[PDB]
Amino acid sequence: KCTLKSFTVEKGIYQTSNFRVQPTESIVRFPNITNLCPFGEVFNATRFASVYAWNRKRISNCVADYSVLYNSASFSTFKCYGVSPTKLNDLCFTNVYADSFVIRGDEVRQIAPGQTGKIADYNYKLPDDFTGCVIAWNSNNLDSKVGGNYNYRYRKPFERPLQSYGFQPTNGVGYQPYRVVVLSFATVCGPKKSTNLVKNKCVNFNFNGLTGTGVLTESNKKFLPFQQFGRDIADTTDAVRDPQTLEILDITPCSFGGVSVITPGTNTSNQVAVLYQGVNCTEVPVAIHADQLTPTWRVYSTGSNVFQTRAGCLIGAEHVNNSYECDIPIGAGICASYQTSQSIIAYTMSLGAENSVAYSNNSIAIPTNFTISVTTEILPVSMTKTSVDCTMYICG
Amino acid sequence: AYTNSFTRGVYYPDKVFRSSVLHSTQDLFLPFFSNVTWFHNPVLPFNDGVYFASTEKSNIIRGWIFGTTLDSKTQSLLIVNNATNVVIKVCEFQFCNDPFLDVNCTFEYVSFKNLREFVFKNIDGYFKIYSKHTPINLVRDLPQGFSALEPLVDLPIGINITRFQTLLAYYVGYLQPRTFLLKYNENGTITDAVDCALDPLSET
Amino acid sequence: IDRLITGRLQSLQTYVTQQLIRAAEIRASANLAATKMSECVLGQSKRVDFCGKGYHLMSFPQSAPHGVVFLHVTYVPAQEKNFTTAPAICHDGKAHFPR
Amino acid sequence: DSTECSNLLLQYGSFCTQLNRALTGIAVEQDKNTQEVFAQVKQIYKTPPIKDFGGFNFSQILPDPSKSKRSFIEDLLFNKVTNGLTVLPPLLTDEMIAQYTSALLAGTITSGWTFGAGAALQIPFAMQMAYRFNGIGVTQNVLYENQKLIANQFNSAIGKIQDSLSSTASALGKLQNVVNQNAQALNTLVKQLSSNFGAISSVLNDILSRLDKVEAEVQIDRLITGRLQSLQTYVTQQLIRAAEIRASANLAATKMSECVLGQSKRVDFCGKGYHLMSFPQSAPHGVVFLHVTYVPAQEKNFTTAPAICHDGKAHFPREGVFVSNGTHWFVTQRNFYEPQIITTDNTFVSGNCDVVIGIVNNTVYDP
Amino acid sequence: DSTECSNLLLQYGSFCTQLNRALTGIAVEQDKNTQEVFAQVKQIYKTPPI
Numbered sequence A: 001k002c003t004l005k006s007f008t009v010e011k012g013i014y015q016t017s018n019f020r021v022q023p024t025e026s027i028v029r030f031p032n033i034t035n036l037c038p039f040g041e042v043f044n045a046t047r048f049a050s051v052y053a054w055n056r057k058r059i060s061n062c063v064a065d066y067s068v069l070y071n072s073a074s075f076s077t078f079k080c081y082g083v084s085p086t087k088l089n090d091l092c093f094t095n096v097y098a099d100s101f102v103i104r105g106d107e108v109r110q111i112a113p114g115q116t117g118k119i120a121d122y123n124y125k126l127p128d129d130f131t132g133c134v135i136a137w138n139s140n141n142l143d144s145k146v147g148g149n150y151n152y153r154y155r156k157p158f159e160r161p162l163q164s165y166g167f168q169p170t171n172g173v174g175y176q177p178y179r180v181v182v183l184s185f186a187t188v189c190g191p192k193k194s195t196n197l198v199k200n201k202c203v204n205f206n207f208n209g210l211t212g213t214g215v216l217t218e219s220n221k222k223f224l225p226f227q228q229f230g231r232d233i234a235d236t237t238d239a240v241r242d243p244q245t246l247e248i249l250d251i252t253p254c255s256f257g258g259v260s261v262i263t264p265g266t267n268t269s270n271q272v273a274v275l276y277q278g279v280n281c282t283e284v285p286v287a288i289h290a291d292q293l294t295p296t297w298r299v300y301s302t303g304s305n306v307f308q309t310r311a312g313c314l315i316g317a318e319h320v321n322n323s324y325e326c327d328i329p330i331g332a333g334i335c336a337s338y339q340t341s342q343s344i345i346a347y348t349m350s351l352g353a354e355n356s357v358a359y360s361n362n363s364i365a366i367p368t369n370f371t372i373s374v375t376t377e378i379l380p381v382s383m384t385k386t387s388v389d390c391t392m393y394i395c396g
Numbered sequence B: 001a002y003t004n005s006f007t008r009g010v011y012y013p014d015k016v017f018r019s020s021v022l023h024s025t026q027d028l029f030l031p032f033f034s035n036v037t038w039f040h041n042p043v044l045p046f047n048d049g050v051y052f053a054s055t056e057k058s059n060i061i062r063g064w065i066f067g068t069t070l071d072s073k074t075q076s077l078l079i080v081n082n083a084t085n086v087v088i089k090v091c092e093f094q095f096c097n098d099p100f101l102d103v104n105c106t107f108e109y110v111s112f113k114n115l116r117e118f119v120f121k122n123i124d125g126y127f128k129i130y131s132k133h134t135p136i137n138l139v140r141d142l143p144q145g146f147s148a149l150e151p152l153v154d155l156p157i158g159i160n161i162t163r164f165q166t167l168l169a170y171y172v173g174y175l176q177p178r179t180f181l182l183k184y185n186e187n188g189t190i191t192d193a194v195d196c197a198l199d200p201l202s203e204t
Numbered sequence C: 001i002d003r004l005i006t007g008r009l010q011s012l013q014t015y016v017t018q019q020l021i022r023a024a025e026i027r028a029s030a031n032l033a034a035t036k037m038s039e040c041v042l043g044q045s046k047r048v049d050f051c052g053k054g055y056h057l058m059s060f061p062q063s064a065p066h067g068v069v070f071l072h073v074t075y076v077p078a079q080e081k082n083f084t085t086a087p088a089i090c091h092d093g094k095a096h097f098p099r
Numbered sequence D: 001d002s003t004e005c006s007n008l009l010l011q012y013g014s015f016c017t018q019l020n021r022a023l024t025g026i027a028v029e030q031d032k033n034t035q036e037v038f039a040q041v042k043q044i045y046k047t048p049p050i051k052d053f054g055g056f057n058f059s060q061i062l063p064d065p066s067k068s069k070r071s072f073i074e075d076l077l078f079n080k081v082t083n084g085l086t087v088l089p090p091l092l093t094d095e096m097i098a099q100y101t102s103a104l105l106a107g108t109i110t111s112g113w114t115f116g117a118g119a120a121l122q123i124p125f126a127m128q129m130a131y132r133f134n135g136i137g138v139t140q141n142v143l144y145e146n147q148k149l150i151a152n153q154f155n156s157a158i159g160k161i162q163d164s165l166s167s168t169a170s171a172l173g174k175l176q177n178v179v180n181q182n183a184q185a186l187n188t189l190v191k192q193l194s195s196n197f198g199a200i201s202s203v204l205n206d207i208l209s210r211l212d213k214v215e216a217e218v219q220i221d222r223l224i225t226g227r228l229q230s231l232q233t234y235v236t237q238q239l240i241r242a243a244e245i246r247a248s249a250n251l252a253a254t255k256m257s258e259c260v261l262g263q264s265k266r267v268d269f270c271g272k273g274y275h276l277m278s279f280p281q282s283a284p285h286g287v288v289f290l291h292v293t294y295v296p297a298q299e300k301n302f303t304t305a306p307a308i309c310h311d312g313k314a315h316f317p318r319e320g321v322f323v324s325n326g327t328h329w330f331v332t333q334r335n336f337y338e339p340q341i342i343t344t345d346n347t348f349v350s351g352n353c354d355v356v357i358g359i360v361n362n363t364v365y366d367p
Numbered sequence E: 001d002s003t004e005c006s007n008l009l010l011q012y013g014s015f016c017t018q019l020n021r022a023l024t025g026i027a028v029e030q031d032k033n034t035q036e037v038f039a040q041v042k043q044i045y046k047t048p049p050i
């Protein structure tokens, strides 16, 4: 009724909807992760150089372990100019410029990127635009001299207001000596996570950043060693290599098709049948209104003589052993009708009564009577005439 | 001196499998039957990228230099084979006519009876190497036969290569933007090609 | 406004193109109806199943909205009997065939 | 199947619905066209167990129970043809189509045209061919006197068709063009998904992941516009193409009603020569007619005159033409040389010798 | 014949090719129409002089 915009429906088969199997879960695959960036080569060296005057250099072309760096209490404190380290675990840069050096904490409190004071402006130069962080530990444990901070100057990330540091050896990195480092920004990219691989179910998927939805399956294509994707004639991706397990998976569409309602007119009955065109009955109780939706809909999904045909799964119609003339057509020689106590039935249509003509080489049949017959024929001849003022239709 | 390039120097343009199909594509390719220069090192422009080849039975070729000048000014690719491995670095190296044998550094890496063929190109700052090896009977010119070069190396390094030279018989041709029709067999190898500009029949 | 002008113009081109195709579909039926009137009504067509099933006798035109209706009068044989038959007859040594 | 795109597609209203209503109109019509052609028979006639059709040999075009149970020639005809899109099945299966071509053929073989005008009336096939000869103005004695020659000319001609259809596929180009056009159009519709239409990428998930919404919606609307225009271009082309196939299906339905169910006298309609009969065979996406025709083949020159003078009366032939062999005069049936003696019973009179140009003097015999 | 425009027209993909293919099929068909109407004769018959 809503499809036709009418409260009264004439007899027929009406397409009302599209059925489309939903992805059941998401699969993510990337290679066996290797060559992580050695951030310890900066942050384990934090006692060494002068934190107001040291040099700095790029870390690049190796995977940024920022996810583990967020969870790990690897230093007494850390702070960042950009986002939190868990957000940095999703990012990349051409390199992160970085350094390690100790200083008096009264100066070193200015060395967090985007901070106030002479460090972030010059002696540990790093505005809020720095794509990264600074971190530290108490230098009084090893980085400070016998006189405290006098072994270094205090005010790039952790690199060149610098003067010989005055912080006493008796206290921690917030005012007394701090052992410290900093690092901030196509090569320094964070690692990519991965899941298990699932087969023979409709899934959402991502292989190396190539994405889709489909039924993943075991396959017998033989790619060359360097090839990663397979394509069909019309550009369409149809196979992939799992980067963790170098065999080939075929990608197949998640099952979909037109949904049509088969009805005698509303004058005759409110009983109906439903055809899921090109669907296999095993797949039907999915996506749209199905087995869940009360006696008002699940009757046409769960029961009422579910039946399989070459046209699709057919629900609500009884299979019948006879043949009759085609009333409402379905496909592949199937037709349906409302019949006697009455229900919707589906049957193979009947071409006509069979007849052996009694031929033999000396027999003829001659008619001995006639009937005059009057046959009606109807032909259309002319449409309703029309003209449209497009100036008024378009601009009113 | 010059030689006819024949149908040499096709290479797999992408990391994709296609089978029993003809695929039409536009890329930097060596045009069929172009003139290819021949040599017995001299410093040559790189242009849009190079088809390079050599005929061997001695292993006297040992590497290449690529960059603008490759003498202390700026980063330059030194690519070497030492028969233990391929060796690469991109340094501002400083040397004479070359660091040839007796016969900063932002990146580094490790990996006549015969013809060795290569294609070198740079797109989006990715320096790309494609290669092939074959035996030969024509120790004198490029053979009149078809085989497709396949990728090796694909480096994001972004250097302005404009000159190159060999490190110690060899042949040089230049890539040009061309449209090719490529034939993939049942196993997804390229097995034939048409350079679409070559003649009216190739356009057809 | 330019989005509405673009959308409404495309929406009108779609209608006019479908009406041009539908007009050709109806004209092919008008040429057929004009031929059925000339051959069936103004004559007696020998063209099998053109002017109704059975052997054609005559037909009558009746008008209808947007069209025409033909009442085809036709002759249909009935009540056959089987008989023995032969292609020719020998009389005085010579073969006779029916006129 | 991107929801962020599908929300923008609602801005366009009824376009992505009247397209489906148009393609549905095409899809129903293909079953109608198939039913206009084949379903012209009310009962499924079937051939007798005996095959004594007067020396004619239909076994190459009749059903074969070792084959569906198609004919021999129908198997050649079936061999020589070779993203939210759904193809749909035809309503009549190839096993139903082959029952209609079987029934039409078994009617035509056993009962002539009679099954096209009432119940099928049996008749001997040699007598059916005598009616087909009368239908072309050749007197029926000509068939019976030449029946074994005529049977062998027919049997020979069917054999050449099997060899032609075995040796080359090039005859079926009309049907193969339908298959090629359907495939070419669908590949073109899918290829157009890869095009940018000026958007920053042709991959919708790039746009959605790389841009903020106020920018992304501007890019997606280019893809929506390009893909909608690419689908309207395909549907418009399919409506124009379906009208060509319908004009061919109406012609094929007419060829079946006139050539198979009768004996059409329309010149060149049922193949070259004077029409005798024709036989349908099924094929992929179409139908094949084997048109059988009589072609006259060994002419001689003769002298002729429009009338003859006897006792002042001018005599004209009833059904024939006057001819001479240079020494004698005869009346002859116009389509095959069989000279008869000129008599009062082969002729009729009108007026005297003065008015007719070129009248000649000869005896007209009185039996 | 602007190069800057032609490079934009490539982004609309296959529309130009299927227009050229449509008008090529239209053009070939006119010669077939004209053949089928007039060329129904197997020999160039010629009238006698008288």
Ligand SMILES: *[C@@H]1O[C@H](CO)[C@@H](O[C@@H]2O[C@H](CO)[C@@H](O)[C@H](O)[C@H]2NC(C)=O)[C@H](O)[C@H]1NC(C)=O
Binding pocket: D051, D057, D059, D060, D159
């Ligand atoms: C009808 O003609 C066919 C050939 O077109 C005849 O079939 C062949 O008959 C011979 C002898 O039996 C066999 O060796 C061939 O193998 C048959 N060919 C096929 C394709 O089956 C057939 O015998 C003829 N029938 C009549 C009644 O004359």
Ligand SMILES: *[C@@H]1O[C@H](CO)[C@@H](O[C@@H]2O[C@H](CO)[C@@H](O)[C@H](O)[C@H]2NC(C)=O)[C@H](O)[C@H]1NC(C)=O
Binding pocket: D325, D326, D327, D328
């Ligand atoms: C023209 O036809 C007539 C009849 O067929 C021919 O006349 C007969 O000729 C044969 C010899 O060829 C004679 O035995 C008959 O007695 C003739 N019959 C009569 C009634 O005369 C005549 O020969 C033919 N003319 C030519 C030039 O062939």
Ligand SMILES: *[C@@H]1O[C@H](CO)[C@@H](O[C@@H]2O[C@H](CO)[C@@H](O)[C@H](O)[C@H]2NC(C)=O)[C@H](O)[C@H]1NC(C)=O
Binding pocket: D309, D360, D361
């Ligand atoms: C056909 O026969 C008639 C006689 O039956 C011929 O007519 C006569 O011909 C002679 C000689 O020319 C005349 O003397 C008579 O006066 C004619 N009579 C009439 C009534 O015309 C006639 O010439 C013959 N026709 C031909 C073509 O030979």
Ligand SMILES: *[C@@H]1O[C@H](CO)[C@@H](O)[C@H](O)[C@H]1NC(C)=O
Binding pocket: A032, A243, A244, A245, A246
């Ligand atoms: C990935 O690692 C597993 C062990 O965790 C190993 O069995 C497998 O072979 C590796 N695959 C690749 C492609 O390196």
Ligand SMILES: *[C@@H]1O[C@H](CO)[C@@H](O)[C@H](O)[C@H]1NC(C)=O
Binding pocket: A267
């Ligand atoms: C349909 O049925 C209703 C009663 O249920 C009746 O009023 C109406 O006239 C009927 N219409 C037709 C077309 O039979």
Ligand SMILES: *[C@@H]1O[C@H](CO)[C@@H](O)[C@H](O)[C@H]1NC(C)=O
Binding pocket: A280, A281, A282
């Ligand atoms: C799919 O459909 C076929 C009939 O087309 C049926 O036999 C088969 O059991 C179905 N497959 C599954 C896995 O349900």
Ligand SMILES: *[C@@H]1O[C@H](CO)[C@@H](O)[C@H](O)[C@H]1NC(C)=O
Binding pocket: A319, A320, A321
């Ligand atoms: C139809 O008949 C078959 C036997 O030929 C039987 O197996 C089947 O159950 C019957 N189905 C119905 C609905 O009668």
Ligand SMILES: *[C@@H]1O[C@H](CO)[C@@H](O)[C@H](O)[C@H]1NC(C)=O
Binding pocket: A368, A369, A370, A371, C079
């Ligand atoms: C012929 O059929 C009519 C009815 O159509 C019947 O009334 C009449 O008696 C029949 N005549 C003969 C001779 O059978």
Ligand SMILES: *[C@@H]1O[C@H](CO)[C@@H](O)[C@H](O)[C@H]1NC(C)=O
Binding pocket: B002, B032, B033, B034, B035
């Ligand atoms: C350049 O190559 C062409 C064949 O492509 C050849 O005809 C021509 O002679 C060559 N020119 C020189 C200078 O060798």
Ligand SMILES: *[C@@H]1O[C@H](CO)[C@@H](O)[C@H](O)[C@H]1NC(C)=O
Binding pocket: B072, B073, B074, B075, B092, B104
């Ligand atoms: C080294 O790299 C820096 C930028 O990181 C650049 O300023 C300098 O010129 C380079 N020097 C050489 C010798 O390449």
Ligand SMILES: *[C@@H]1O[C@H](CO)[C@@H](O)[C@H](O)[C@H]1NC(C)=O
Binding pocket: B082, B084, B085, B086, B087, B110, B111
């Ligand atoms: C060859 O290169 C490898 C590293 O790729 C190195 O270990 C080895 O010592 C080199 N040998 C020679 C002879 O240069």
Ligand SMILES: *[C@@H]1O[C@H](CO)[C@@H](O)[C@H](O)[C@H]1NC(C)=O
Binding pocket: B158, B159, B160
């Ligand atoms: C490469 O050289 C061009 C000018 O020739 C210049 O625009 C570009 O910035 C250079 N890139 C690098 C990485 O030096």
Ligand SMILES: *[C@@H]1O[C@H](CO)[C@@H](O)[C@H](O)[C@H]1NC(C)=O
Binding pocket: A222, B185, B186, B187
């Ligand atoms: C394809 O590859 C297989 C091994 O994977 C090989 O046996 C076969 O000969 C190859 N076929 C072709 C056509 O190259």
Ligand SMILES: *[C@@H]1O[C@H](CO)[C@@H](O)[C@H](O)[C@H]1NC(C)=O
Binding pocket: A358, A365, C080, C081, C082
């Ligand atoms: C004609 O005769 C056959 C037997 O030779 C018989 O089967 C058939 O029913 C008869 N038909 C009529 C109309 O009498």
Ligand SMILES: *[C@@H]1O[C@H](CO)[C@@H](O)[C@H](O)[C@H]1NC(C)=O
Binding pocket: D299, D300, D301
């Ligand atoms: C008829 O005779 C003329 C010569 O008088 C000749 O050219 C022509 O070919 C002949 N035709 C036949 C059918 O013999």
Ligand SMILES: *[C@@H]1O[C@H](CO)[C@@H](O)[C@H](O)[C@H]1NC(C)=O
Binding pocket: D305, D306, D357, D358, D359
């Ligand atoms: C044919 O033409 C000749 C010469 O004019 C004339 O004598 C003769 O009577 C004509 N015959 C016929 C049958 O027209």
